[PDB]
Symmetry: none
Subunit: 109 residues, 4 copies
């Protein structure tokens, strides 16, 4: 009678509250799916970057490797020149003394 | 009243069901919190890597700059040597003709 | 595999031995060249000396030939003078006795 | 597999190339053996010629010095004779006039 009116109230409140619960669950659901999404994104970025880091180091050690390649070449070419210079100076010194020493030349008397 | 026994049951199911709801919500809560942690980890890794990438490029370029610095120095020193050799080459030939011909007319 | 380690190990050595080969070749190269230069020098000296030897013989012969030319000329001139003196020697002594003996009776 | 065929192919080329290297080194070796000899020859020629040059100059000088020695001696003897002739030629002329005046 009176207690029945109040029960029907209590049930009526529940009835609407569970509607709200259903709405809030969908938010939560969306939320996990977007956290899910955001996590897949981040995960693929970390892949992308690790890849680039390796690609940079690879190319990097390459450039350096390329230049030491040149440097040694240049040290070689420097070697040959430096050696050629030494041997000419000494062969030019012999020729200049041999000219000085006119015992190579006939007397003019 | 038979319908009263059934009402009391319908309510009894609700009351037990909401117990289960409360238990599932805690899982869900835990779930968001763990995902929270995993996301902070990933986020700090991406920081760590962006830092290394910059650190690698930095070191990479300076080093390269450093070596082209050497190469051009070597090209210079090669220039002077190569030029010194040529002059000698001529002075050598001049000296040698100055002996063959400084005795054709002795 | 194991055989793969040894192939790589073997190939890596080949790398190293041919490095040594390259170094030894450069020595050899330098060797042929330093010798090339020294040989051209010697060769031009022999030219120089052959030239001087001919220049000396040339100057030697001619000058000497020139001086014996003079010496004989001088022997000739000495011949005429020495002969002219002998004849003067005679004329004179006759004249001096003549005046001595032309005062002696006259 | 495929990379194995190419490794072997690479090594097989090296094998043959080093055969060619060995052949070229022998040429080079022979080459130096020619050059060593030719150099000793040239070096002994230069010795020979420097010796002759000195021998020529030696013979050349002393001889010349010897002959100018004679030439000056001959000039001296020519001096005395030439002077003696001048003296006599006049003494003659004096004697012959003193004959004229006696």
């Amino acid at each position: 009678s009176e207690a029945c009116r109040d029960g029907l109230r209590a049930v009526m409140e529940c009835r609407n509250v569970t509607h709200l619960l259903q709405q809030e669950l969908t938010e939560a659901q969306k939320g996990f799916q977007d956290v899910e999404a955001q996590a897949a994104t981040c995960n693929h970025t970390v892949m992308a970057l690790m890849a680039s880091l390796d690609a940079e180091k690879a190319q990097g050690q390459k450039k350096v490797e390329e230049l030491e390649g040149e440097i040694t070449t240049l040290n070689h070419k420097l070697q040959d020149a430096s050696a050629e210079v030494e041997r000419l100076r000494r062969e030019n010194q012999v020729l200049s003394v041999r000219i000085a020493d006119k015992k190579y030349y006939p007397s003019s008397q």
